[PDB]
């Protein structure tokens, strides 16, 4: 399906669907088209940027798939600052955009193409929730409660989703998540983000515990030697 609306930028964020968060606008070039969409079906084109995160983005400075997304509010804010919070729908490729004086006109496509077998599919589903689950007790940034509230949950698309938004991803792994179709390919991609951060996080652990036995080792010598000092000075001046 073809689709020609605007384009906002996101320095460092991939918004997926299903996903809600707030944005922070504060240019003279955004809010005045975060406006004029807001009276035009309430939809935006949310598209990432590269490598130097630059404030003037080009023509070429964005990625080839963004995120629709509709608005779910704007609040204006003591700084003259837009918070405007998000919910993204589905994502779409770029045929061509255009810097049509301030904000982005582009076009125009629509995500929609699954996998044959889908007892693979079943199986790598399970072995996702399992991994994510043993990955939130590693994590405890992510509430524990999110994990089982959306364990219910059918779409796999939205299961990889919903595992892609609740990590700590380099943005390059963001939209590769975003730009693969294949939902199977990045269920096995974010459980490969997974294992590595899960393996990172127990070395980090295992080194954490040598150095606090460490420190109380260290800390116990010193009073046990700042006694010994205290004791015989006391017995010098004895006798």
Same mark, same amino acid.
């Given at each position: 399906?073809?689709?020609?609306?605007?384009?906002?930028?996101?320095?460092?964020?991939?918004?997926?669907?299903?996903?809600?968060?707030?944005?922070?606008?504060?240019?003279?070039?955004?809010?005045?088209?975060?406006?004029?969409?807001?009276?035009?079906?309430?939809?935006?084109?949310?598209?990432? #940027?590269? &490598?130097?995160?630059?404030? @003037?983005?080009?023509?070429?400075?964005?990625?080839?798939?963004?995120?629709?997304?509709?608005?779910?509010?704007? %609040?204006?804010?003591?700084?003259?600052?837009?918070?405007?919070?998000?919910?993204?729908?589905?994502?779409?490729?770029?045929?061509?955009?255009?810097?049509?004086?301030?904000?982005?006109?582009?076009?125009?496509?629509?995500?929609?193409?699954?996998?044959?077998?889908?007892?693979?599919?079943?199986?790598?589903?399970?072995?996702?929730?399992?991994?994510? @689950?043993?990955?939130?007790?590693?994590?405890?940034?992510?509430?524990? &409660?999110?994990?089982?509230?959306?364990?219910?949950?059918?779409?796999?698309?939205?299961?990889?989703?919903?595992?892609?938004?609740?990590?700590?991803?380099?943005?390059?792994?963001?939209?590769?998540?975003?730009?693969?179709?294949?939902?199977?390919?990045?269920?096995?991609?974010?459980?490969?983000?997974? &294992?590595?951060?899960?393996?990172?996080?127990?070395?980090?652990?295992?080194?954490?515990?040598?150095?606090?036995?460490?420190?109380?080792?260290?800390?116990?010598?010193?009073?046990?030697?700042? #006694?010994?000092?205290?004791?015989?000075?006391? %017995?010098?001046?004895?006798?």
């Amino acid at each position: 399906e073809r689709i020609e609306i605007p384009v906002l930028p996101l320095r460092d964020v991939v918004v997926y669907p299903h996903m809600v968060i707030p944005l922070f606008v504060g240019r003279e070039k955004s809010i005045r088209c975060l406006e004029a969409a807001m009276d035009h079906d309430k939809k935006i084109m949310l598209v990432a #940027q590269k &490598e130097a995160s630059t404030d @003037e983005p080009g023509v070429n400075d964005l990625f080839t798939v963004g995120t629709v997304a509709s608005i779910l509010q704007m %609040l204006k804010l003591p700084d003259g600052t837009v918070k405007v919070l998000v919910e993204g729908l589905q994502r779409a490729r770029i045929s061509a955009l255009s810097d049509n004086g301030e904000h982005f006109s582009a076009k125009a496509e629509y995500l929609e193409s699954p996998t044959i077998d889908e007892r693979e599919q079943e199986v790598l589903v399970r072995t996702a929730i399992s991994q994510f @689950e043993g990955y939130i007790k590693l994590n405890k940034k992510i509430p524990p &409660e999110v994990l089982t509230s959306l364990n219910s949950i059918d779409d796999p698309a939205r299961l990889a989703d919903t595992i892609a938004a609740h990590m700590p991803l380099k943005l390059a792994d963001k939209q590769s998540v975003l730009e693969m179709s294949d939902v199977n390919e990045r269920l096995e991609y974010l459980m490969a983000m997974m &294992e590595s951060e899960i393996d990172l996080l127990q070395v980090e652990k295992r080194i954490r515990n040598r150095v606090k036995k460490q420190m109380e080792k260290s800390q116990r010598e010193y009073y046990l030697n700042e #006694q010994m000092k205290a004791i015989q000075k006391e %017995l010098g001046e004895m006798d």
